[PDB]
Amino acid sequence: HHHHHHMVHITLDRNTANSWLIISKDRRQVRMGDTHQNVSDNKERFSNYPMVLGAQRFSSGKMYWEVDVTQKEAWDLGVCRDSVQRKGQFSLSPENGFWTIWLWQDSYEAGTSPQTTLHIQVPPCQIGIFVDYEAGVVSFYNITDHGSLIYTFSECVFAGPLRPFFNVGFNYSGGNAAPLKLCPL
Ligand SMILES: C[C@]1(O)C[C@@H](Nc2ncccc2F)C1
């Protein structure tokens, strides 16, 4: 790719975080805590899963950011509608307003309905996410493998403003405590 020159400074929105997440002072890192984090509930918070949104809202243009997934067993990354469901159980699909990929149990998959198998030669330590609002495109790039394409959603029905989306995953195993980190441009 050559998408680095549409780079945007993403920060995490504390108010949308699941109440077990810990967001760094600079709002660039998030991890799963071992307990509920002494914050009030609100209607924005994701209740069932360890999810958080970016503070930035996008309704036009080309946006690019990179996330460090080093030493994680499980995560979800991408973008979602500002209007996505926050409470109870839901699937990650374009029908529900999510354009995402994930790692789960040693397999990488795109959040289609049903999910699509990804083919990645070099397990990524850093992921690039590119959104072209006008084109209706969300693409994922493997920064560890010279920016090689992972997956492209096209003809996307954004149907409103978009927010960066993150899931740090559960830590039942004790092997998934590592943070998601937004990487410097
Ligand atoms: C228990 C902790 O607070 C330390 C750990 N941090 C990291 N672990 C793995 C890769 C990168 C990290 F920054 C989460």
Q: Look up residue 136 and give its two tokens.
A: 């209706």
Closest Cα to atom 2, ligand 1: which residue? Answer: 178
Residue-wise DSSP of 103-172: EETTEEEE--SS-EE---SS--SEEEEEEETTTTEEEEEEGGGTTEEEEEE-S----S-EEEEEE----S
Residue with tokens 């309704």: 59
How many whole angstroms separate alpha carbon 130 and alpha carbon 151? 11
Residues 6+ apart with CB under 8 A from 73: 103, 169, 173, 175, 176
Closest listed residue to residue 128, CA positions, set 19, 43, 27, 7: 7
Closest Cα to atom 4, ligand 1: which residue? Answer: 178
Of the chain, the end-to-end C-alpha distance in Å amounts to 15
How many whole angstroms separate alpha carbon 114 and alpha carbon 26? 36
**Is-contact 76 101, C-beta < 8 A?**
yes
**Is-contact 45 147, C-beta < 8 A?**
no
Closest Cα to atom 9, ligand 1: which residue? Answer: 178
Ligand 1, residues at Cβ distance < 6 Å: 31, 70-71, 177-179
Ligand 1 centre distance from Cα of residue 179 (Å): 6
- Strands 29-32 and 21-23 come out as antiparallel
For residue 181, give the ligand 1 atom closest to its CA: 13
How many whole angstroms separate alpha carbon 14 and alpha carbon 22? 9
Ligand 1 centre distance from Cα of residue 180 (Å): 9
The CA distances from residue 19 to 4, 31, 99, 108, in Å, are 33, 11, 23, 27
| Cα 158-184-105 angle, rounded to 5 deg | 65
Reported resolution, Å: 1.5
Q: Look up residue 158 and give its two tokens.
A: 């954004």
Q: HEC string of 54-111?
A: ECCCECCCEEEEEEECCCCCCEEEEEEECCCCCCCCCCCCHHHCEEEEEEECCEEEEC
Ligand 1 centre distance from Cα of residue 18 (Å): 19
The CA distances from residue 39 to 36, 62, 168, in Å, are 8, 34, 18
Residue with tokens 């108010």: 15
- From 32, 71, 72, 168, the mutation candidate for ligand 1 (largest count of ligand atoms within 8 A of CB) is 71
CA atoms within 13 A on the CB side of 144: 13
**Is-contact 48 120, C-beta < 8 A?**
no
Domains annotated for the chain, with CATH where assigned, are: 4-182 (2.60.120.920)
Residues 6+ apart with CB under 8 A from 79: 58, 98, 99, 100, 129, 131, 138, 162, 163, 164, 165
Residues 6+ apart with CB under 8 A from 30: 12, 17, 21, 22, 23, 24, 52, 166, 168, 179, 180
Ligand 1 centre distance from Cα of residue 60 (Å): 35
Ligand 1 centre distance from Cα of residue 43 (Å): 29
Region at 136 (left for phi over 0; alpha for psi -120 to 50; beta for the rest): left
